[PDB]
Paper text:
Reversible phosphorylation of the alpha subunit of translation initiation factor 2 (eIF2a) is pivotal to control of global rates of protein synthesis and to modulating mRNA-specific translation in eukaryotes. Our studies reveal the essential role of a third cellular factor, G-actin, in endowing the complex with substrate specificity and provide the first glimpse at the structure of a ternary holophosphatase complex possessing such substrate specificity.
PPP1R15A and [name] both formed stable complexes with PP1 (both the PP1A and [name] isoforms were tested) but crystals suited for structural determination only arose from complexes between human [name] and mouse [name]. [name] followed a trajectory along the surface of [name] similar to that traced by the regulatory subunits spinophilin and PNUTS/PPP1R10. From there [name] winds its way through the C-terminal groove to the front of the catalytic subunit. Along this path [name] Y650 occupies a position similar to spinophilin F459 and PNUTS F411 whereas [name] I652 occupies a position similar to spinophilin T461 and PNUTS F413, whose side chains engage the ϕϕ motif binding-site of PP1. The side chain of [name] R658 engages a deep pocket on the PP1 surface, occupying the same position as spinophilin R469 and PNUTS R420 and forming a conserved salt bridge with [name] D71 in the ‘Arg site’, as predicted by Choy and colleagues. The interactions between [name] and [name] were thus confined to residues conserved in all PP1 isoforms, explaining the lack of preference of PPP1R15 for binding different PP1 isoforms. [name] in these crystals conformed to previous structural determinations of PP1 isoforms (RMS: 0.19–0.29 Å over more than 240 Cα atoms), indicating that the binding of PPP1R15 did not change PP1's structure.
Author numbering:
A (entry chain B): 639 to 658
B (entry chain A): 6 to 300
Write the structure that this text describes.
C-alpha cells in the first residue's frame, strides 16, 4: 500500500463563521 | 453507570439552533464521561494502530457548532471512523460541549472513534486559555480537575495502516524507536521538555536545517530532511499533524511528506482560515474537505 493524494479538493462555505 | 444514548441525544439536539446555545448536562453525567473514557483510553494502546478508511481532523478548540458541521459533512459516527489530533478545548466558546460529545462518541464507539492528546489537553495550558474559566462558570473547579485526570490518559500518537504517522505537534530529536512512545506510562502530565513535550509541541519549518529552537519558546522546529529521514527509518509515507493555523485548513510540507490539518474555521475570530478534514480511503488515497468561513 502507498499513500496518494486526490488533487480535487471539496470546498464548503459556512455562513455566520465570520463575526460569530 | 452512563446512559450514553441520552447524553448524545441532548448534545446533538441543539443542531440548527441559534449558534452559541449551550447543552446543560448534569455534573455527574460529565464526570461519568471522564471516568469511563479514562478507562477506555488506558485499556487501548498509547500508540494507536488504526486501519483505513477513516477521517482525520485537526484542532477544534471549543468550536462546537463547527464540529457539528464536520460530522454533517463527514458522516456522524459510526457511519464514518474518526481520528482527532488533539486541542479540543480552549479559545473557543463551547469547549465543554465539544469535549463532552467527543468523549461520548469514544465511549459509544470505542473501536470506530479515536482521540489523540493535544498540547491544550494539559492543565497548565487550559487553566489559562479558557477551559478552566468555562468549567468554573458553568460547573465548578472539581469538574475541571476531573477533566485533567481524563486528559492525562489520552493516547499520544497513531499509525494508520503502517504508513501514516499521526500526532498533534511533530517529531522529536529524542525519538529513535516507536517503542519509546509505547513505554510512556499513563496517567501523565506533559513535561516542559522531552519526548512527550515534542510530540505535542514541535513544528516543521522550511528555513531550518536539522533541529532548531522553536520561536514559541517550547520544544523545537525541524526541517524537511528530518522528515525524510524519519519516514525512511520507520517505513512510513506521511506525517499527519495539527497544531498550526493554516490558511486552507491543510498545508503540505517537504514535498507532501508531511501535512498539517487544522479544523477550526476562522480561529479566534482572528485568522479567517478554513478548517479541513482529511479522508483516507482503504487504498490510502487521501482527499480533503474544507470548511471556509463566510459572513
Ligand atoms: Mn496545539
Amino acid at each position: 500500500k502507498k499513500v496518494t493524494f486526490l488533487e480535487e479538493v471539496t470546498e464548503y462555505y459556512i455562513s455566520g463563521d465570520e463575526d460569530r | 453507570m452512563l446512559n450514553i444514548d441520552s447524553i448524545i441525544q441532548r448534545l446533538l439536539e441543539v443542531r440548527g439552533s441559534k449558534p452559541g446555545k449551550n447543552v446543560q448536562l448534569q455534573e455527574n453525567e460529565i464526570r461519568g464521561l471522564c471516568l469511563k473514557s479514562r478507562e477506555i483510553f488506558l485499556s487501548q494502546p498509547i500508540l494507536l494502530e488504526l486501519e483505513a478508511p477513516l477521517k482525520i481532523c485537526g484542532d477544534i478548540h471549543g468550536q462546537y457548532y463547527d464540529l457539528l458541521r464536520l460530522f454533517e459533512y463527514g458522516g456522524f459516527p459510526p457511519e464514518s471512523n474518526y481520528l482527532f489530533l488533539g486541542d479540543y478545548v480552549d479559545r473557543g466558546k463551547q469547549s465543554l460541549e465539544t469535549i463532552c460529545l467527543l468523549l461520548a462518541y469514544k465511549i459509544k464507539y470505542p473501536e470506530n472513534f479515536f482521540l489523540l492528546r493535544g498540547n491544550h489537553e494539559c492543565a497548565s495550558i487550559n487553566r489559562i486559555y479558557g477551559f478552566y474559566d468555562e468549567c468554573k462558570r458553568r460547573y465548578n473547579i472539581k469538574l475541571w480537575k476531573t477533566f485533567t485526570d481524563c486528559f492525562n490518559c489520552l493516547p499520544i500518537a497513531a499509525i494508520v495502516d503502517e504508513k501514516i504517522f499521526c500526532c498533534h505537534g511533530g517529531l522529536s530529536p529524542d525519538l529513535q524507536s516507536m517503542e519509546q512512545i509505547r513505554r510512556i506510562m499513563r496517567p501523565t502530565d506533559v513535561p516542559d521538555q522531552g519526548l512527550l513535550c515534542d510530540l505535542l509541541w514541535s513544528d516543521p519549518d522550511k528555513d531550518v536545517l536539522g533541529w532548531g529552537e522553536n520561536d514559541r519558546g517550547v520544544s523545537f522546529t525541524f526541517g524537511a530532511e528530518v522528515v525524510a529521514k524519519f519516514l525512511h527509518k520507520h517505513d512510513l509515507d506521511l506525517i499527519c499533524r495539527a497544531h498550526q493555523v493554516v490558511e486552507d485548513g491543510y498545508e503540505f510540507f517537504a514535498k507532501r511528506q508531511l501535512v498539517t490539518l487544522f479544523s477550526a474555521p476562522n480561529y479566534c475570530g482572528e485568522f479567517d482560515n478554513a478548517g479541513a478534514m482529511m479522508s483516507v480511503d482503504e487504498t490510502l488515497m487521501c482527499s480533503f474537505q474544507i470548511l471556509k468561513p463566510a459572513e
